[PDB]
Design a protein around this ligand. Structure first.
Ligand SMILES: *[C@@H]1O[C@H](CO)[C@@H](O)[C@H](O)[C@H]1NC(C)=O
Ligand SMILES: OC[C@H]1NC[C@@H](O)[C@@H](O)[C@@H]1O
Ligand SMILES: [Zn+2]
Length: 1014
């Protein structure tokens, strides 16, 4: 295994290093506004060395943006694909590339058999070529790597089954900035090449000058380079035709033949395209070839890529004709005129890359190595696209919830083969597809129109319900005596209980377990642990009585704590935000211990009086002018008092101190250690009254944030043996700090209401001497070192915080883990900040045509980990990566993949069992079974189950960490006939494993295995 910590990779281009040196000056470079006047030696190409030009027709189809997926399909995409089939069929030399499989599958299944065959033929013959082949062209900032893989697999599995092809070249022309997580996944999925486009204009200029636009992109910790994937970065401002033929859009626009009038399109540079004729072809060719040769100066081979497309292009038959015929005339002339020394033709993306590597092998070009990422993107001036790191946070959080439900549903149902009547495969396909669709760069990014966001939400809601159905049917089968098991595949044996989604104050959705002497004495509940190691976690349920005791199936008492059910309300009368307690519902809390990838059953029983093993939390409401707060049967009376500073400690965990405003002030790790200053503060960013305005994409603050006026907020303190908390009703946010014995959990119920042109940020202020360094993660896969650059505007220093961020000095580190992707930064030494929500009244000129005014209450969750790191073996000062500690990693897992909770629906569960998976191996803490998916239906003689195994890298800080079993996923199911290592999509077998044993992976490595069972 490679050492991902102590060996700084030697690369030609390291993006953090490049950023430190670049000046980012935005000067007018001429026709190529953000570049320079490209010059070339006409004698460079000749009869013995010609410029090979591949014109690649394409159509950018967004699976939802200003219209929903279905609306676009009906109005544009079905016509684009129908006419592509006809035109390619009739013109053998014409080519076309396609990226979004969600649309292609929608189209294909509606085609008659005759057309399906014609379509398969033009794909088999190479005219229509799929690029990437994912369900969508995913966002690369907010997306979790697990979902990027999910959607890639969904699209490629469909392609293999129906088109019999697996793309090895990726095409990503629209994500707003790019992540190295893509080449990581692609390279492990059979890919050999990838193309990107949206990178900072300053980066394009810098790399272009050094002809480093094509490079071998390796991971920041990869010293050997085995993760490298050849990457092509487009050099210009856009992927449209005016910005893909050469440096001068005024000239290039003249070669987009759809801009003549009848199509309602024109050239903003004032010179329209002119139909090619024998009379003007020589002059037109001279202009075009000149542009091509200028573009070619920016690359190292004699093979040039010229994309030919734009948004939803190649729709009308007349459009196919005008583009094809005119280019055909140009090709005939150019290729016949030796003085040009050019051979141009329509081509596909794979053809371009194949030619490039042929030139490379011929020894005519050597490519530079590169590591790093391409955030934060700016397409012009100071317009940095960091706003979408937060836009529509409700759905960003929903993405993470569904991410987990899909994993849990696929894993729980994978243990058995199911009869087709159970509709398991059907429900799982639906769930995978709706979540995959949301990975689109206008989905999770929060950059779609209001009604489109609603469509995505509805789709994800249906997906969650599908997951619940599969999960509950699976639990019933896994924990019921076989000879008693009598399933009704439409019946709900269990109801899922989720305490953090939609969340308290967002939607009263969870059911109350109703117990009573005259109705029902007890209730069975079951917890699922999707992680491959034994896990304990506090779980809570709503019960109709405070007198409830918990037992495991062996009838062993389990210590429990009961707390009131508190709800916060904006009292329109008193004009205050205060909590009201329920007098009919209560929360029971207890520690559940669940087997690796297993289940554990518990029983809740009611009693007439306080049970021996259940304690009750005390409650203190701090504020002036208090009023009584009755809690029905709840044992202890609520206490009141004027606002004051308070300190709390649960178990042997840390001691937290809070200000009289209910905000964290300090953390004391041990009774001996000191009170480390850690202050939570909420501030607000505004919008400029002059110039460019912030919108769904852009973050253009009118200066540093201003503190939110808190006034004298109401603070609620709940103190319990198992769980304590401090909650405060601040303007726009009910802020809560929960303590359970370890790193606290933070929950923010964010309701920005009608606060227009406001972005709410949560900041942490500490004494950590971090300077200008901080770390943020990329797709929940790796942590990358960031350097605050004062030479760049505030918004440029904002980065995606898909799952976590941290700052540190020689001795101390503060890590903030998130349960949802949001934007954040460290604008000053010792600080960390993350945006909660943003409400913008205006559009930011990127085509959306609206601001962001559809905000809705969202419950953001986090874990705050303060640690001493002076003993940890960390990367050198020059290493571009950072790594989490065991505690921080486990805290992240507690947010993203918590235990699942099931409540038995009926009064009695006959044949109930107390546990499942007790014999499952408990793998080392840094290893995870990211995916467990049965790949075959019940009729298959040989069953196949696929697993995606990921091993992260945790810092060694002197903790023994021992006793763990080897995890061999290939033997998790009995009767294993073979074990094979496969690409991450499970589509290609890479190795036949002897002994049918799937070996564990190395740190920061991800592998896939498929076990076959007879
Ligand atoms: C799929 O393509 C391969 C070539 O890569 C070919 O050998 C095989 O017969 C094809 N399968 C079908 C009929 O779809
Ligand atoms: O300008 C941004 C916007 N342009 C049109 C579409 O491609 C959409 O996805 C994108 O966000
Ligand atoms: Zn797009």
């Amino acid at each position: 295994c490679q050492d991902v910590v102590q060996d700084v990779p030697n690369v030609d281009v390291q993006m953090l290093e490049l950023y430190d040196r670049m000046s980012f000056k935005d000067i007018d470079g001429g026709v190529w506004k953000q570049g320079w006047n490209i010059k070339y030696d006409p004698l460079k190409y000749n009869a013995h060395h010609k410029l090979k030009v591949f014109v690649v027709p394409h159509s950018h189809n967004d699976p939802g943006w200003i219209q929903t997926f279905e609306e676009y399909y009906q109005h544009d995409t079905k016509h684009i694909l129908s006419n592509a089939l006809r035109h390619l069929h009739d013109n053998p030399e014409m080519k076309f590339i396609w990226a979004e499989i969600s649309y292609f599958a929608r189209f294909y299944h509606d085609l008659g058999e005759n057309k399906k065959l014609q379509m398969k033929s033009i794909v088999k013959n190479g005219q229509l070529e799929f690029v990437t082949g994912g369900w969508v062209m995913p966002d690369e900032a907010n997306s979790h790597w697990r979902n990027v893989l999910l959607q890639l697999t969904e699209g490629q599995t469909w392609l293999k089954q129906f088109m019999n092809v697996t793309p090895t070249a990726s095409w990503a022309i629209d994500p707003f900035g790019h992540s190295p997580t893509m080449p990581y996944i692609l390279q492990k999925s059979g890919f050999k090449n990838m193309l990107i486009q949206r990178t900072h204009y300053s980066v394009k200029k810098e790399l272009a000058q050094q002809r480093q636009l094509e490079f071998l992109w390796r991971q920041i910790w990869d010293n050997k380079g085995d993760t490298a994937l050849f990457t092509h970065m487009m050099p210009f401002y856009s992927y449209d035709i005016p910005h893909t033929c050469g440096p001068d859009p005024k000239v290039c626009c003249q070669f987009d033949f759809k801009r003549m009038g009848s199509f309602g399109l024109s050239c903003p540079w004032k010179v329209p395209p002119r139909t090619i004729s024998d009379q003007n072809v020589a002059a037109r060719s001279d202009l075009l070839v000149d542009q091509w040769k200028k573009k070619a100066e920016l690359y190292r081979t004699n093979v040039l890529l010229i994309p030919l497309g734009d948004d939803f292009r190649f729709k009308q038959n007349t459009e196919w004709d005008v583009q094809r015929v005119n280019y055909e005339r140009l090709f005939e002339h150019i290729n016949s005129q030796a003085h040009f020394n050019v051979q141009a033709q329509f081509g596909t993306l794979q053809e371009y890359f194949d030619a490039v590597h042929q030139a490379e092998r011929a020894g005519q070009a050597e490519f530079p190595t590169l590591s790093g990422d391409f955030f934060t993107y700016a397409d012009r001036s100071d317009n940095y696209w960091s706003g979408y790191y937060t836009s529509r946070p409700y759905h960003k959080r929903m993405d993470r919830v569904l991410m987990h439900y899909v994993r849990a549903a696929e894993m729980l149902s994978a243990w058995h083969s199911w009869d087709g009547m159970a509709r398991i495969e059907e429900r799982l396909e639906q769930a995978r597809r709706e979540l995959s669709l949301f990975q689109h760069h206008d989905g999770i990014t929060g950059t779609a129109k209001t009604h489109v966001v609603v469509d995505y939400e509805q789709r994800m809601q249906e997906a969650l319900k599908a997951c619940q159905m599969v999960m509950q049917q699976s639990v019933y089968r896994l924990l019921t005596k076989p000879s008693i098991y009598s399933p009704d595949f439409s019946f709900s044996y269990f109801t899922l209980d989720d305490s953090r989604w939609p969340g308290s104050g967002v939607e009263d959705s969870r059911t109350t377990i109703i117990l009573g002497e005259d109705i029902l004495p007890s209730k069975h509940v079951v917890m699922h642990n999707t992680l491959p190691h034994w896990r304990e976690q506090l779980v809570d349920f709503y019960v109709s009585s405070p007198f409830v005791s918990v037992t495991d199936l062996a009838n062993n008492p389990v210590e429990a704590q009961v707390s009131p059910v508190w709800s916060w309300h904006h009292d329109t009368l008193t004009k205050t935000i205060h909590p009201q307690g329920s007098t009919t519902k209560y929360r029971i809390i207890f520690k559940a211990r669940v087997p690796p990838m297993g289940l554990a059953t518990y029983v809740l029983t009611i009693s007439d009086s306080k049970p021996e093993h259940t304690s009750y939390a005390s409650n203190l409401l701090l504020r002036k002018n208090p009023t009584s707060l009755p809690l029905g049967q709840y044992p202890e009376d609520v206490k009141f008092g004027d606002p004051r500073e308070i300190s709390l400690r649960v178990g042997n965990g840390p001691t937290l101190a809070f200000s009289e405003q209910g905000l964290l002030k300090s953390i004391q790790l041990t009774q001996d250690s000191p009170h480390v200053p850690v202050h939570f503060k909420f501030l607000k960013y505004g919008v400029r009254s002059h110039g460019d305005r912030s919108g769904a994409y852009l973050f253009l603050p009118n200066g540093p944030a201003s503190p939110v006026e808190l006034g004298q907020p109401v603070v609620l303190v709940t103190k319990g043996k198992l769980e304590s908390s401090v909650s405060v009703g601040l303007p726009s946010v009910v802020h809560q700090t929960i303590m359970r014995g370890g790193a606290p959990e933070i929950r923010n119920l964010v309701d920005i209401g009608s606060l227009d042109n406001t972005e709410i940020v949560m900041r942490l202020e500490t004494h950590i001497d971090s300077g200008d360094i901080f770390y943020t993660d990329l797709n929940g896969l790796q942590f990358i070192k960031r350097r605050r650059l004062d030479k760049l505007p505030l918004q440029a220093n904002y980065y995606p915080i898909p799952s976590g961020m941290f700052i540190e000095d020689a001795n101390t580190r503060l890590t903030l883990l998130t349960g949802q992707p949001l934007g954040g930064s460290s604008l000053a030494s010792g600080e960390l900040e993350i945006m909660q929500d943003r409400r913008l009244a205006s559009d930011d000129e990127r085509g959306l045509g609206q601001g962001v005014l559809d905000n809705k209450p969202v419950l953001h969750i986090y874990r705050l980990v303060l640690e001493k790191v002076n003993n940890c073996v960390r990367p050198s000062k020059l290493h571009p990566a950072g790594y989490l500690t065991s505690a921080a990693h486990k805290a992240s897992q507690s947010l993203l993949d918590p235990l699942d909770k099931f409540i038995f629906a009926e009064n009695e569960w006959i044949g109930a069992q107390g546990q499942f998976g007790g014999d499952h191996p408990s793998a080392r803490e840094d290893l995870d079974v990211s995916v467990m998916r049965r790949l075959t239906k019940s009729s298959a003689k040989t069953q196949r189950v696929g697993y995606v195994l990921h091993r992260t890298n945790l810092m060694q800080c002197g903790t023994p960490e021992e006793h763990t079993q080897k995890l061999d996923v290939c033997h998790l199911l009995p009767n294993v006939a073979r074990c094979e290592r496969t690409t991450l999509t499970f589509l290609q077998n890479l190795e036949h494993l002897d002994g049918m044993v799937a070996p564990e992976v190395c740190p920061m490595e991800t592998a896939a295995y498929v076990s076959s069972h007879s």
